[PDB]
Design a protein around this motif. Structure first.
Motif, PDB file in Angstrom:
ATOM      1  N   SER A  93       0.820  -1.207   0.000  1.00 51.76           N
ATOM      2  CA  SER A  93       0.000   0.000   0.000  1.00 51.76           C
ATOM      3  C   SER A  93       0.856   1.259   0.000  1.00 51.76           C
ATOM      4  O   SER A  93       0.434   2.297  -0.522  1.00 51.76           O
ATOM      5  N   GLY A 272      -7.896  -5.127   6.860  1.00 54.58           N
ATOM      6  CA  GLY A 272      -8.988  -6.070   7.000  1.00 54.58           C
ATOM      7  C   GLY A 272      -9.814  -5.960   8.264  1.00 54.58           C
ATOM      8  O   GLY A 272     -10.977  -6.374   8.276  1.00 54.58           O
ATOM      9  N   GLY A 402     -11.668   0.998  -6.004  1.00 52.90           N
ATOM     10  CA  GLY A 402     -10.726   1.577  -6.934  1.00 52.90           C
ATOM     11  C   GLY A 402     -10.782   0.886  -8.288  1.00 52.90           C
ATOM     12  O   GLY A 402     -11.693   0.119  -8.603  1.00 52.90           O
ATOM     13  N   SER A 403      -9.770   1.179  -9.097  1.00 51.73           N
ATOM     14  CA  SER A 403      -9.657   0.586 -10.421  1.00 51.73           C
ATOM     15  C   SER A 403      -8.206   0.676 -10.869  1.00 51.73           C
ATOM     16  O   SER A 403      -7.389   1.378 -10.268  1.00 51.73           O
ATOM     17  N   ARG A 406      -3.617  -0.704  -9.510  1.00 51.87           N
ATOM     18  CA  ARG A 406      -3.404  -0.407  -8.099  1.00 51.87           C
ATOM     19  C   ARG A 406      -4.714  -0.372  -7.316  1.00 51.87           C
ATOM     20  O   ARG A 406      -4.837   0.364  -6.334  1.00 51.87           O
ATOM     21  N   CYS A 408      -7.807  -2.359  -5.000  1.00 49.83           N
ATOM     22  CA  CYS A 408      -7.724  -3.197  -3.810  1.00 49.83           C
ATOM     23  C   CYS A 408      -7.362  -4.626  -4.190  1.00 49.83           C
ATOM     24  O   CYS A 408      -8.153  -5.324  -4.834  1.00 49.83           O
ATOM     25  N   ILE A 409      -6.164  -5.067  -3.799  1.00 47.83           N
ATOM     26  CA  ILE A 409      -5.720  -6.414  -4.134  1.00 47.83           C
ATOM     27  C   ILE A 409      -6.539  -7.473  -3.406  1.00 47.83           C
ATOM     28  O   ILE A 409      -6.583  -8.627  -3.845  1.00 47.83           O
ATOM     29  N   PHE A 413     -11.410 -11.327  -1.643  1.00 44.07           N
ATOM     30  CA  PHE A 413     -11.394 -11.855  -0.283  1.00 44.07           C
ATOM     31  C   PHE A 413     -12.330 -11.066   0.624  1.00 44.07           C
ATOM     32  O   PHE A 413     -13.072 -11.652   1.422  1.00 44.07           O
TER      33      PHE A 413
HETATM   34  C1  HEM Z   1     -15.037  -4.004   1.927  1.00 48.54           C
HETATM   35  C2  HEM Z   1     -13.718  -4.013   2.144  1.00 48.54           C
HETATM   36  C3  HEM Z   1     -12.654  -3.194   1.385  1.00 48.54           C
HETATM   37  C4  HEM Z   1     -12.784  -2.065   0.673  1.00 48.54           C
HETATM   38  C5  HEM Z   1     -14.071  -1.242   0.391  1.00 48.54           C
HETATM   39  C6  HEM Z   1     -11.469  -1.704   0.163  1.00 48.54           C
HETATM   40  C7  HEM Z   1     -11.171  -0.609  -0.619  1.00 48.54           C
HETATM   41  C8  HEM Z   1      -9.890  -0.331  -1.081  1.00 48.54           C
HETATM   42  C9  HEM Z   1      -9.544   0.792  -1.919  1.00 48.54           C
HETATM   43  C10 HEM Z   1     -10.555   1.841  -2.406  1.00 48.54           C
HETATM   44  C11 HEM Z   1      -8.229   0.749  -2.172  1.00 48.54           C
HETATM   45  C12 HEM Z   1      -7.446   1.764  -3.040  1.00 48.54           C
HETATM   46  C13 HEM Z   1      -7.446   1.318  -4.494  1.00 48.54           C
HETATM   47  C14 HEM Z   1      -7.096   2.466  -5.386  1.00 48.54           C
HETATM   48  O1  HEM Z   1      -6.175   3.249  -4.987  1.00 48.54           O
HETATM   49  O2  HEM Z   1      -7.420   2.421  -6.606  1.00 48.54           O
HETATM   50  C15 HEM Z   1      -7.683  -0.416  -1.504  1.00 48.54           C
HETATM   51  C16 HEM Z   1      -6.352  -0.811  -1.540  1.00 48.54           C
HETATM   52  C17 HEM Z   1      -5.855  -1.950  -0.973  1.00 48.54           C
HETATM   53  N1  HEM Z   1      -6.566  -2.879  -0.219  1.00 48.54           N
HETATM   54 FE1  HEM Z   1      -8.559  -2.762   0.257  1.00 48.54          FE
HETATM   55  N2  HEM Z   1     -10.562  -2.646   0.600  1.00 48.54           N
HETATM   56  C18 HEM Z   1     -11.241  -3.577   1.351  1.00 48.54           C
HETATM   57  C19 HEM Z   1     -10.694  -4.680   1.973  1.00 48.54           C
HETATM   58  C20 HEM Z   1      -9.399  -5.124   1.919  1.00 48.54           C
HETATM   59  C21 HEM Z   1      -8.895  -6.334   2.529  1.00 48.54           C
HETATM   60  C22 HEM Z   1      -9.755  -7.308   3.346  1.00 48.54           C
HETATM   61  C23 HEM Z   1      -7.585  -6.429   2.250  1.00 48.54           C
HETATM   62  C24 HEM Z   1      -6.580  -7.520   2.663  1.00 48.54           C
HETATM   63  C25 HEM Z   1      -5.979  -8.328   1.791  1.00 48.54           C
HETATM   64  C26 HEM Z   1      -7.228  -5.284   1.456  1.00 48.54           C
HETATM   65  C27 HEM Z   1      -5.983  -4.975   0.947  1.00 48.54           C
HETATM   66  C28 HEM Z   1      -5.697  -3.871   0.181  1.00 48.54           C
HETATM   67  C29 HEM Z   1      -4.404  -3.548  -0.360  1.00 48.54           C
HETATM   68  C30 HEM Z   1      -3.162  -4.433  -0.132  1.00 48.54           C
HETATM   69  C31 HEM Z   1      -4.478  -2.412  -1.049  1.00 48.54           C
HETATM   70  C32 HEM Z   1      -3.325  -1.713  -1.785  1.00 48.54           C
HETATM   71  C33 HEM Z   1      -3.282  -2.193  -3.230  1.00 48.54           C
HETATM   72  C34 HEM Z   1      -2.196  -1.485  -4.011  1.00 48.54           C
HETATM   73  O3  HEM Z   1      -1.807  -0.374  -3.556  1.00 48.54           O
HETATM   74  O4  HEM Z   1      -1.589  -2.091  -4.944  1.00 48.54           O
HETATM   75  N3  HEM Z   1      -8.346  -4.514   1.278  1.00 48.54           N
HETATM   76  N4  HEM Z   1      -8.725  -1.049  -0.842  1.00 48.54           N
END
Ligand code: HEM
Ligand SMILES: O=C(Nc1ccccc1CCCl)Nc1cc(C(F)(F)F)ccc1-n1ccnc1
Length: 462
Positions: A93, A272, A402-403, A406, A408-409, A413
């Motif tokens: 992140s 998470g 997002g989209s 980059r 949400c990986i 899950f």
């Molecule tokens: C309903 C639950 C979740 C929502 C709404 C959410 C939403 C988001 C959003 C909006 C981003 C930014 C994407 C962007 O910049 O385009 C993100 C990034 C990320 N999320 Fe989540 N997320 C959720 C759950 C999780 C969970 C459970 C994990 C654990 C694996 C996780 C891991 C990550 C990671 C690792 C990133 C960074 C990805 C990157 O920078 O390459 N997220 N998430």
């Protein structure tokens, strides 16, 4: 001041900034309220200043597509640094450019659809643990706070998915895992700390040499130690569906280091724990004030899982109304509230000159409730995501995860984890609004998309 007339020379409208602060005073209503007002009074493209940092907002679907997907590896690759990161700069992140691309490649197979299916039986176990703790909460005849029951659930899921720790956090709040990880709450970017470093980015390098990490140092070092043991344990106890194991075996066959290993493990907890429980709380609030949705969803869960059958990866993807409930709740409450990318070079997008160093932002909350794409935005109508209308929604306006490369990986899950909880709880309980429930649920004015009052509902057995 110095970098405050940047939007004037480009002919871009926006609220006039005060010296040394920019438009931070406009955050008194919160990130979401400020974005919607700016969309109203300025149209599709405006700008403002987070201190001296210029932030450009875009709402054109093709312009959002160019920033997040098309010109991502070239220009819009990284997000804005948010504070003293410490050793956690190796987190996916927080990693930037080449480090991120290598880290994402080394972590993408961990989130395969197949790898998710192997995790369904494990996540299913705590749905039963969730029901048991919910049963006693419902037999007491008193309202129950969703944040605690779900917070106990998401903690149990994260511990059993990231590592091999199988616990009942609601009944055993003394395990060192549950104790420290409960302090990994979201970052209130409008608090005294983050507001200061946003206005004073020059203080970020100073906090780094003081070894003042943005994450609680006690939790980080404890998890850095706990991982070291479990690693050595599984080594001298060779026997696996674990984010840790999925990264340990991939370490054998650039490369992922041991400290980079711990950083990503902490990220999955931080991403998470409070994130999942909030959305689950938001979903159940909407199901109580709209019992018709809760009824048709309970019927569909029973239709696909008769006799309160255990869910399955194949059956979860089958229920169409449950996906509609989750999607609509995420539209009304996108907990990210915003998507940001740092412009790394002089580039022109869709006839707009974007100078280097500007933070391009997509106001996800403002787009999700903008009337130009949604009719009656303030009303909770899950039918917007029916199969017929599921193709009539622009994917670059509704961006809860997002989209682009980059995004949400852990999107799949997170959706699987929440749905497995919703299936097991709705098929055993019904949620009724009590007196203490805020009928017009008010959103916070801070840097988090959380309810003003913690959501309390009446729980009864079926
Ligand atoms: C309903 C639950 C979740 C929502 C709404 C959410 C939403 C988001 C959003 C909006 C981003 C930014 C994407 C962007 O910049 O385009 C993100 C990034 C990320 N999320 Fe989540 N997320 C959720 C759950 C999780 C969970 C459970 C994990 C654990 C694996 C996780 C891991 C990550 C990671 C690792 C990133 C960074 C990805 C990157 O920078 O390459 N997220 N998430
Ligand atoms: O990137 C995001 N967006 C997002 C998404 C949801 C809520 C808030 C936000 C932040 C804007 Cl208020 N959250 C995030 C940030 C970090 C860290 F900043 F520590 F690196 C680590 C993990 C995550 N996370 C959480 C959930 N999914 C990913």
């Amino acid at each position: 001041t110095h970098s405050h007339g940047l939007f004037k020379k480009l002919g871009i409208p926006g609220p006039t900034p005060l010296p040394f602060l920019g438009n931070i005073l406009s955050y008194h209503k919160g990130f979401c309220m400020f974005d919607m007002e700016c969309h109203k009074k300025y149209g599709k493209v405006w700008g403002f200043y987070d201190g001296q940092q210029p932030v450009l907002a875009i709402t054109d679907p093709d312009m959002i597509k160019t920033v997040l997907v098309k010109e991502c590896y070239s220009v819009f690759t990284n997000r804005r640094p948010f504070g003293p990161v410490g050793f956690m700069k190796s987190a996916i992140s927080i990693a930037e450019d080449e480090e991120w691309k290598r880290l994402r490649s080394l972590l993408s197979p961990t989130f395969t659809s197949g790898k998710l299916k192997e995790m369904v039986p494990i996540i299913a176990q705590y749905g039963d643990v969730l029901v048991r703790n919910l049963r006693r909460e419902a037999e007491t005849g008193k309202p129950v706070t969703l944040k605690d029951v779900f917070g106990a659930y998401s903690m149990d899921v994260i511990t059993s998915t990231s590592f091999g720790v199988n616990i009942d956090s609601l009944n055993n709040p003394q395990d060192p895992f549950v104790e420290n990880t409960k302090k990994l709450l979201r970052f209130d970017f409008l608090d005294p700390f983050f507001l200061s470093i946003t206005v004073f980015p020059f203080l970020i390098p100073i906090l780094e040499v003081l070894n003042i990490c943005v994450f609680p140092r006690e939790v980080t070092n404890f998890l850095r130690k706990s991982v070291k043991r479990m690693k050595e344990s599984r080594l001298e106890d060779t026997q696996r569906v674990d984010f840790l194991q999925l990264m340990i075996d991939s370490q054998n066959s650039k490369a992922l280091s041991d400290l980079e290993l711990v950083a990503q493990s902490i990220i999955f907890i931080f991403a998470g724990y409070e994130t999942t429980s909030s959305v689950l709380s938001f979903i159940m609030y909407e199901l109580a004030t709209h019992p018709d949705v809760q009824q048709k969803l309970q019927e569909e869960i029973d239709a696909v899982l008769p006799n309160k059958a255990p869910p399955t990866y194949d059956t979860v993807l089958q229920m169409e109304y449950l996906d509609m409930v989750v999607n609509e709740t995420l539209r009304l409450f996108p907990i990210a509230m915003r998507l940001e990318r740092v412009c790394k070079k002089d580039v022109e997008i869709n006839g707009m000159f974007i100078p280097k160093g500007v933070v391009v932002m997509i106001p996800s909350y403002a787009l999700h409730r903008d009337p130009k794409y949604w009719t009656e935005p303030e009303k909770f109508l899950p039918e917007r995501f029916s199969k017929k209308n599921k193709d009539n929604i622009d994917p670059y306006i509704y961006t809860p995860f997002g989209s682009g490369p980059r995004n949400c990986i852990g999107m799949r899950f997170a959706l699987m984890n929440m749905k497995l909880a919703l299936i097991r709880v709705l098929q055993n309980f019904s949620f009724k609004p009590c007196k203490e429930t805020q009928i017009p649920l008010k959103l916070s004015l801070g840097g988090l998309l959380q309810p003003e009052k913690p959501v309390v509902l009446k729980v009864e057995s079926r």
